Design a protein around this ligand. Structure first.
Ligand SMILES: [Mg+2]
Ligand SMILES: [Mg+2]
Ligand SMILES: [Mg+2]
Ligand SMILES: [Mg+2]
Ligand SMILES: [Mg+2]
Ligand SMILES: [Mg+2]
Ligand SMILES: [Mg+2]
Ligand SMILES: [Mg+2]
Ligand SMILES: [Mg+2]
Ligand SMILES: [Mg+2]
Ligand SMILES: [Mg+2]
Ligand SMILES: [Mg+2]
Ligand SMILES: [Mg+2]
Ligand SMILES: [Mg+2]
Ligand SMILES: [Mg+2]
Ligand SMILES: [Mg+2]
Ligand SMILES: [Mg+2]
Ligand SMILES: [Mg+2]
Ligand SMILES: [Mg+2]
Ligand SMILES: [Mg+2]
Lengths: 48, 48, 670
RNA sequence: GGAUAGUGGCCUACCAUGGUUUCAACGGGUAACGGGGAAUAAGGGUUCGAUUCCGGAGAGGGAGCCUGAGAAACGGCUACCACAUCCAAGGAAGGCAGCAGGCGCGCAAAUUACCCAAUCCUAAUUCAGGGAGGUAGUGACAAUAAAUAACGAUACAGGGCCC
RNA sequence: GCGGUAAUUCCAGCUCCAAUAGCGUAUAUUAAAGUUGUUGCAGUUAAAAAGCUCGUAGUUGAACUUUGGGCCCGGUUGGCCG
RNA sequence: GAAUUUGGACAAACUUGGUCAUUUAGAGGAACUAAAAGUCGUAACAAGGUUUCCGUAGGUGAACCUGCGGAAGGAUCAUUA
């Protein structure tokens, strides 16, 4: 909502990397460290 | 009411058996503020 | 019938040229209110949002960039309100600087303006508890054209490279509340100052609905004339803006009240109030004559069962033939079988803790009652009702009750608000003797003893507001009510809460309900304000016919601003038809289970009590319906039938209802 | 014959009775300046082109004319029409569709900034002048490039590679 | 498209996906559209062969008139040799 | 050689009626809407019509019949030559 005047630049859980880095993450989330669940590639599962 | 409202297009087709009609416009802005930003509590509304 | 159309080049060009010539004419007419040579009065109010900031300085900049040292020097000596005519653009400005120690004085200042300038600090970040609230509250009550301007920018680094940073961060802060603008102007530079002055002069100020539809005069000179020893005539020299004033209509003056007019003269004719005078009385004596047919005067003393006869059992008659058997010492049973014939900080803290506790209790357990064994349930709820569907059955508005307020008859019963509003506003527009842009002597009748509080029109703003028809007359009003940001605190529905709508402020003990539309106009009485959604606040207060935005607050002496801003919203309806039923839930545990009949425990403690509530439906928060059968023991256990199969984890409940009445309101001053 | 720098119904007399047309004249529409070109499609197309170069037209709307090689010129003149300014009430001035800037209009568009140093133009002219043009400001029109992290050890944790 | 005590289909959080200093939305337009069809549609029953013939503009229009043989000239690629 | 004047071509513009075309402010009147409310008519009342069509004519009526000419876009059994 209201960030106070102090947006003057000059004078929680872990974050996700941005840009290139993020893609890297995905490349290993899907191809270096493959997770084969129930005979399929499951993305976003809870308890199974 | 009496509020300035910036409108755009909106594609809701009306239906026959229930007498639902097709409005063709959605409010995009009210009083100069974006309907979205209000709805995100991002910006506040000057009320006049 | 009629043939078709084939518009030519010429026809087209002409319709265009006419449309645009008309547009231009109308625009000139609408831009003639500020003919800066004789008939103009552009009110600019200067509002700094930072403690360590001087408004006099902000003005100094704006008028030093007009190259007029005299008009600056002549103001330092002794003034706070100025009549400054700029020759560069030919314009008549009126500058107002508020008492920045009084919050409500700030609001009063801006709420009359055509323009609101905001002072911003390059040094000090705006306060979350004060200046921010200035922004929001101004914004809610109504603002015309606003501007964002700075003065402290030179106080930072001398190199522009760092100043522009501050400027832009301020721009993005200011954009948040006021997206209409994207440029916070810097007075330090001659260009921006010349430009903001330029705008104030030239640019036409937008309209604030409620203030423009009832007229207003900012007073320059206020004199008093003695007529009678105990009362006289306040004379007020000022220019009319808005819709204008009529001699017959009343005039409000903030922190003074509503008064009636005696004479009005123009200096750009003489009009005097005649026989069509609006009178200085709340409850009109014609309101007593309007509510003459009292329809339901039901006697709850003449009841053997709960009032629910519309959907319940039948009037059971119990003719008691009691004869006395004379065996010494004998049960009521033997006797029933012998003569049978057939034919201050501590207080606030403790109380407030208790209110928070009761509110959270009201969230976890809504409207439930806890009956004691000694408590006769019948008596304790004897006045209540027990309707099946709260939005279907036939509650009525015209019912007579000892709990109803004495004044209830004497109230202004507007049939339709939406139409009455329009009709009366058109009346006021047509019957306006004194239009906008007129200089006026206003002769108002006035009780002498209040002359002590009246200040000087140059050090303190003195505004004179118009009222419409019957606006002095009380009525049953419904407000829209929404909580102020960052306000978790509890707010019950009977405590005094000051309300500002229009310019008028009345302390109110408002009944909170949910404005969910009902076919019978009957709404649940919510003891405490809902923490998430828009609610409705109903009470007996004077009418408003322009749907003014309302500010709800509770005066707190400790805070800088001597005001705790509770909530906001709008004057919705002048309606009496809204009835409010206090619900009352009775709770009971389903003891034992048979394949169709459930024995229920701890909801009564006498069998006669169970008799009394037989017809009343039973609902379970598991979402299931049912009814009672008969009383088991001499302890109030009762057998019951239901819709589905219920376990010992469910709660069987009763809903009983009572009429809740709006409460009288008194004006608020100081 | 007259007029024009000159051909020419361009105009004037006098003669003829012609000229265009379903191969679409004439009229009406265009939220139409024309082209170089732009978007998109395998191709063929469809759709844009107010806008950086070329050509034309206009300078609030019409008409008229001085000067001059060249203007039917409007940062020249005259009148009428529409607006509009100063006045001491007699009069006198006015055209931003040039650069900035304001109002209005709208869904919709920037600074009342610095300079002749480039580019080129004008002049009696190497020097003067040029909001033509250039430079910066504003601006998420677009278009290009591409930060927001790279490693290691450790341990826990597992899989795989050969004994 | 899909339901209601128990909802992957609504609301909030958690998670994940896509494109990423950019991404959504509106109007227009091109593609998709062989739904404008010259290239390239369709016309018994799905929209669509004029009731029928005659007839000018228009579009369209059978076959046939130096073929066949002989000689010479010099080019530009490609092979087998260099 | 100035004021002034004769007649021309060029020709803005004005006045007037008449005519279409619009912008308008008003008044005359008529008709449609319901997140309005209730009232009867038939709602809260019961069924009946069911070859279907085409052109045309008429009748009406609250609808629908009906005359003439067309069409199958309508369900060929049996015997025999
Ligand atoms: Mg055009
Ligand atoms: Mg294609
Ligand atoms: Mg072009
Ligand atoms: Mg154009
Ligand atoms: Mg050009
Ligand atoms: Mg020209
Ligand atoms: Mg112009
Ligand atoms: Mg010359
Ligand atoms: Mg000209
Ligand atoms: Mg010019
Ligand atoms: Mg020029
Ligand atoms: Mg310009
Ligand atoms: Mg130079
Ligand atoms: Mg330029
Ligand atoms: Mg861009
Ligand atoms: Mg097709
Ligand atoms: Mg068919
Ligand atoms: Mg067909
Ligand atoms: Mg045929
Ligand atoms: Mg041939």
């Amino acid at each position: 909502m209201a960030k106070v005047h102090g947006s003057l630049a000059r004078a929680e859980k872990p974050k996700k990397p941005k840009g290139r880095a993020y893609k890297r993450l995905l490349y290993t989330r899907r191809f270096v460290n493959v997770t084969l669940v129930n005979g399929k590639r499951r993305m976003n599962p809870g308890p199974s | 009411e009496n509020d300035e409202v910036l409108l755009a297009g909106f594609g809701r087709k009306g239906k026959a058996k229930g007498d639902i009609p097709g409005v063709r416009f959605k409010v995009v802005k009210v009083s100069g503020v974006s309907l979205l930003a209000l709805w995100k509590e991002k910006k506040e509304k000057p009320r006049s | 019938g009629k043939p078709d159309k084939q518009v030519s080049k010429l026809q087209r060009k002409n319709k265009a040229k006419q449309l645009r010539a008309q547009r231009i004419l109308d625009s000139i007419e609408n831009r003639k209110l500020f003919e800066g040579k004789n008939g103009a009065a552009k009110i600019i109010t200067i509002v700094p949002l930072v403690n360590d900031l001087d408004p006099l300085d902000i003005l100094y900049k704006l008028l030093k960039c007009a190259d007029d040292e005299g008009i600056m020097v002549q103001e330092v000596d002794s003034k706070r309100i100025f009549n400054v005519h700029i020759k560069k653009f030919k314009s008549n400005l009126k500058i107002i600087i508020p008492d920045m120690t009084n919050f409500l004085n700030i609001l009063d200042c801006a709420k009359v303006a055509d323009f609101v300038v905001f002072g911003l600090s390059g040094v000090q970040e705006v306060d979350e508890e004060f200046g921010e609230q200035i922004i929001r509250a101004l914004e809610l009550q109504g603002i015309a054209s606003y501007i964002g301007v700075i003065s402290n920018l030179s106080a930072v680094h001398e190199k522009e490279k760092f100043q522009l940073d501050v400027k832009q961060s301020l721009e993005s802060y200011f954009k948040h509340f006021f997206p209409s603008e994207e440029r916070v102007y810097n007075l330090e530079k001659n260009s921006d100052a010349l430009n903001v002055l330029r705008t104030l002069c030239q640019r036409l100020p937008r309209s604030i609905n409620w203030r423009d539809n009832r007229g207003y005069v900012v007073a320059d000179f206020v004199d008093f004339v003695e007529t009678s020893p105990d009362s006289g005539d306040l004379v007020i020299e000022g220019t009319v803006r808005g819709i204008g004033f009529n001699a017959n209509r009343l005039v409000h003056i903030p922190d003074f009240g509503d008064f009636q007019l005696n004479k009005i003269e123009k200096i750009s004719t003489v009009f005097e109030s005649n026989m069509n005078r609006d009178t200085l009385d709340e409850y009109a004596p014609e309101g007593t004559e309007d509510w003459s047919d009292y329809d339901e005067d039901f006697e709850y003393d003449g009841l053997t069962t709960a009032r629910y006869d519309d959907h319940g059992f039948l009037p059971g008659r119990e003719q008691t033939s009691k004869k006395a058997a004379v065996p010494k010492g004998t049960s009521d049973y033997q006797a029933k079988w012998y003569l049978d014939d057939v034919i201050s900080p501590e207080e606030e803290e403790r109380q407030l803790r208790e209110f928070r506790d009761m509110e959270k209790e009201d969230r976890e357990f809504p409207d439930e009652i806890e009956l004691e064994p000694s408590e006769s349930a019948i008596e304790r709820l004897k006045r209540y009702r027990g309707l099946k569907n709260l939005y279907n059955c036939d509650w009525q508005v015209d019912e007579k009750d000892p709990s109803s307020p004495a004044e209830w008859k004497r109230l202004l019963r507007i049939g339709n608000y939406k139409n009455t509003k329009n009709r009366i506003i058109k009346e006021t527009k047509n019957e306006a003797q004194a239009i906008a842009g007129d200089r006026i002597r206003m002769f108002i009748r006035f009780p002498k003893f209040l002359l002590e509080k009246i200040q000087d029109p140059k050090q303190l703003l003195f505004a004179v507001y118009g009222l419409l028809l019957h606006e002095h007359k009380n009525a049953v009003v419904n407000f829209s009510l929404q909580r102020w940001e960052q306000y978790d605190k509890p707010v019950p529905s009977q405590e005094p809460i000051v309300v500002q709508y229009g310019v008028r402020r009345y302390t109110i003990q408002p009944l909170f309900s949910q404005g969910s539309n009902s076919p019978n106009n009957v709404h649940k009485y919510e003891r405490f304000l809902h923490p998430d959604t828009v609610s409705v606040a109903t009470c007996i207060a004077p009418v408003d016919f322009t749907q003014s935005p309302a500010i709800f607050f509770k005066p707190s002496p400790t805070d800088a601003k001597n005001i705790e801003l509770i909530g906001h919203g709008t004057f919705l309806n002048a309606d009496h038809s809204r009835i409010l039923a206090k619900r009352a839930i009775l709770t009971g545990h389903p003891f034992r289970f048979h394949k169709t009949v459930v024995t229920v425990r701890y909801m009564f403690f006498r069998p006669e009590d169970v008799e009394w509530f037989k017809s009343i439906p039973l609902f379970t928060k598991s979402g299931r319906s049912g009814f009672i059968k008969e009383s088991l023991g001499t302890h109030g256990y009762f057998k019951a039938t239901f819709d589905g199969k219920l376990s010992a984890q469910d709660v069987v409940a009763m809903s009983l209802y009572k009429r809740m009445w709006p409460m009288p309101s008194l004006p608020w001053n100081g």
